[PDB]
């Protein structure tokens, strides 16, 4: 174990560079407030003493715009209906929840939204009746591809007036793709007599039309859903009130933090203006990167707590909420611990069926590639997303290869003999810093886009290699000590 004093020094350095970079980004935003306001409209509110919120982000300004109008009221109605069903008719709770989900989808997306969800569900079920996993995967891929077609997009836009309902329908269908694909694959793999009647059409309708995750919520494993819908054990509503109170308090705190950190610094406006990235100093570049990844983390905390809170009230166990990205230090850790539900779906339904490590390293590579391909194609399959997927697969493959190489008994014995485990920890932290220096760039490409990632690569690494790259590596080195030191808690 490392001595406590120098680990505390590493934590101090990590917090110091986070906070100084945040201050630099705040200064840059304040000194460039007028031109950014002129180019992109900035929302004016009295929540923070007159500071102007940066509404350039799409997911935040879309989900809060929907929540203030329809989503929060419908989610509260779902909570009330679930509690009433648990109190009065516990046996028929899944069907009541399914009916409420259909009614909520109708009232929020018109008849076409419900009709399209039903069509996708029915087609997936009819195809899965053949009990072939490959045919089911092609059916799911075709159903997902029907979203990206220009003609279908034009028809769907003609369906709706506000043009935000079309985006809501697209997101709902994209999530439904995963949900009915998971159910269909589970039906294909079902060979147990006890579970023969669990995979029926009404159960598929109940699984698909679950309101908390109808639109954006995390992928809920069908095994857990079917297990919890049939417990017939009450949740002691007196404790459910306390659970709701604590969840609401935490969600309000998270939302306030997200609003504060969007108000103080205009991350999205700065990334939208590529010419401003070249002008601002390297400290501002690092601060923008850290603030952007942290804001994505906080935004998805807010956007996943509400489905998680609704599940916890419903008795379900939700997938674990994202861990703080300032803890993350490697590609595998980021994938395992950030988006738990989608990672579990990819492992169970995309990674394993193609074939995991059982086919050897080369086969593993293919499997990983396939998984990554799908997730990129799931998010839209844009060019920047494909570049992010390629870079991310390269990172994961390099991590796995190095871990396999170092864990060989001969090399492990040699490194144990040469130096103490303290030196091994220091070298592992330096390596993980060199890895996270590219992990953050890949995530910036995912968030900022191709231009933002290229600008970061040029300025941080190519243009300023002699001292800027070394300083970034050292700061991420202390950061990696902190991350690895905390990683033992959840290892």
């Amino acid at each position: 174990m490392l001595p406590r004093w120098e680990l505390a020094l590493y934590l101090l350095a990590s917090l110091g560079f986070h906070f100084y970079s945040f201050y630099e980004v705040y200064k840059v935003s304040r000194e460039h407030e007028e031109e950014l306001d002129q180019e992109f409209e900035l929302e004016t509110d009295t929540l923070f003493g007159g500071l102007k919120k940066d509404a350039t982000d799409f997911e935040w300004s879309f989900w809060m715009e929907w929540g203030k109008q329809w989503l929060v009221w419908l989610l509260l109605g779902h909570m009330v209906v679930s509690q009433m069903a648990t109190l009065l008719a516990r046996k028929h709770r899944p069907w009541i929840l399914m009916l409420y989900g259909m009614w909520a989808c109708w009232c929020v997306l018109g008849t076409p939204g419900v009709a399209m969800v039903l069509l996708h569900t029915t087609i997936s079920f009819c195809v899965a009746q053949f009990r072939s996993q490959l045919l089911t995967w092609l059916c799911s891929l075709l159903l997902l591809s029907t979203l990206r077609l220009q003609g279908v997009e034009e028809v769907k836009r003609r369906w709706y007036k506000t043009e935000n309902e079309y985006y809501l329908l697209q997101f709902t269908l994209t999530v439904r793709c995963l949900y009915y694909t998971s159910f269909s694959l589970e039906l294909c793999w079902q060979q147990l007599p006890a579970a023969s009647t669990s995979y029926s059409f009404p159960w598929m309708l109940a699984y698909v039309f679950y309101y908390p995750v109808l639109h954006n919520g995390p992928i809920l494993s069908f095994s857990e859903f079917i297990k919890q819908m049939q417990q017939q054990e009450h949740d002691s509503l007196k404790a459910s009130l306390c659970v709701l109170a604590l969840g609401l308090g935490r969600l309000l705190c998270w939302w306030w933090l997200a609003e504060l950190m969007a108000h103080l610094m205009y991350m999205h406006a700065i990334y939208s203006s590529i010419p401003l990235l070249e002008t601002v100093s390297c400290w501002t570049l690092g601060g923008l990167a850290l603030a952007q990844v942290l804001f994505f983390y906080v935004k998805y905390l807010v956007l996943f707590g509400v489905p998680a809170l609704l599940m916890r009230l419903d008795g379900l166990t939700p997938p674990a909420l994202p861990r703080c990205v300032s803890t993350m230090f490697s590609f595998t850790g980021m994938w395992r611990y950030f988006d738990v539900g989608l990672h579990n779906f990819l492992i169970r339904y995309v990674y394993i069926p193609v074939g995991g490590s059982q086919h050897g390293l080369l086969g593993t590579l293919f499997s990983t590639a396939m998984t990554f391909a799908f997730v990129s194609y799931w998010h839209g399959g844009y060019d920047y997303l494909w570049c992010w997927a390629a870079l991310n697969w390269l990172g994961v493959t390099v991590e796995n290869g190095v871990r396999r190489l170092v864990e060989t008994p001969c090399i492990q014995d040699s490194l144990a003999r040469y130096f103490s485990p303290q030196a091994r920890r220091r070298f592992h932290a330096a390596l993980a810093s060199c890895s996270t220096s590219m992990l953050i760039l890949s995530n910036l490409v995912f968030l900022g886009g191709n231009e933002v990632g290229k600008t970061y690569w040029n300025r941080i690494f190519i243009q300023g290699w002699p001292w800027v790259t070394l300083s970034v590596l050292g700061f991420l080195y202390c950061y990696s000590h902190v991350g690895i030191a905390w990683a033992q808690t959840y290892a």
Binding site: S272, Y382, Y384, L385
Partner: peptide
């Protein structure tokens, strides 16, 4: 997660 990607 989140199907909202590529909009800015």
């Amino acid at each position: 997660c989140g199907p909202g990607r590529g909009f800015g």
